[PDB]
């Protein structure tokens, strides 16, 4: 399914934007993927 | 040659082996359907959400 893969991209990036809305910057470089995807035991969000 | 139906959330295309008009390997989004007495794969079930 190609349309589901588009919704997965648009869905996951809205969640990352919700964190980027929490802090007052939507900047890409301020949020390397280490921020979102690091597990909770190391202080990251633990996003899958 | 296409038998189409929609189960609980799956959209299924059932295509038999002899109507395939060529046999190609597939990625794992494809069920290989096995006849019980031959143990031979004689149809391919194609899945979509």
């Amino acid at each position: 399914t190609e349309p589901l893969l588009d919704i997965l991209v648009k869905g996951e990036t809205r969640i990352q934007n919700r964190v980027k809305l929490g802090l007052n910057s939507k900047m890409p470089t301020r949020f390397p993927p280490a921020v979102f995807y690091t597990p909770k035991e190391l202080g990251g969000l633990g996003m899958i | 040659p296409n038998l189409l139906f929609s189960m609980c959330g799956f959209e299924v295309r059932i295509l038999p082996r002899q109507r395939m008009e060529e046999v190609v390997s597939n990625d794992e989004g494809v069920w290989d359907l096995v006849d019980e007495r031959t143990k031979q794969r004689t149809a391919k079930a194609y899945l979509k959400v």
């Binding site: 390397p32 993927p33 280490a34 921020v35 995807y37 690091t38 597990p39 035991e41 190391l42 202080g43 990251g44 899958i48 | 794992e28």
Partner: protein, 129 residues
């Protein structure tokens, strides 16, 4: 691949149950350990502590489906009862491989303020809540 592996495992369990009837002995519980997490039901459900009272639970799927009319929060999972089916996915391997994909722990801690704490090594830190 779950279902094809499930058919052979319950075939293997049925014969191993059949062999223990012939030898009149209890199943060794480690002979079956290699297929502990195999099989669609999940063979581990045969050795649950509460399997006798769960045998009288009937229609647990159809009641779980119609929980959408009783409750506001249904669940993310409405197809599986973990008591009747076991755990059907393991994601513990995902957590370790992300850390490798992010370059290891020491690369991740460069992003953080760990060195400002003054801690010599990561390992003792546990987390406060």
């Amino acid at each position: 691949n779950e279902f094809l592996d499930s058919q052979r495992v319950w075939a293997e369990y049925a014969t191993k149950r059949q062999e223990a009837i012939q030898q009149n002995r209890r199943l060794a519980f480690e002979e079956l350990e290699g297929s502990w997490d195999r099989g669609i039901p999940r063979i581990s459900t045969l050795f649950q502590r509460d399997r006798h009272t769960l045998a009288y639970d009937r229609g647990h799927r159809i009641r779980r489906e119609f929980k959408q009319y009783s409750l506001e929060r249904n669940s993310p999972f409405w197809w599986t009862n973990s008591h009747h089916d076991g755990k059907l996915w393991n994601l513990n391997a995902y957590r370790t491989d992300v850390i490798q994909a992010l370059g290891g722990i020491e690369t991740i801690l460069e992003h953080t303020l760990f060195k400002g704490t003054g801690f010599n090594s990561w390992e003792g830190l546990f987390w406060e809540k």
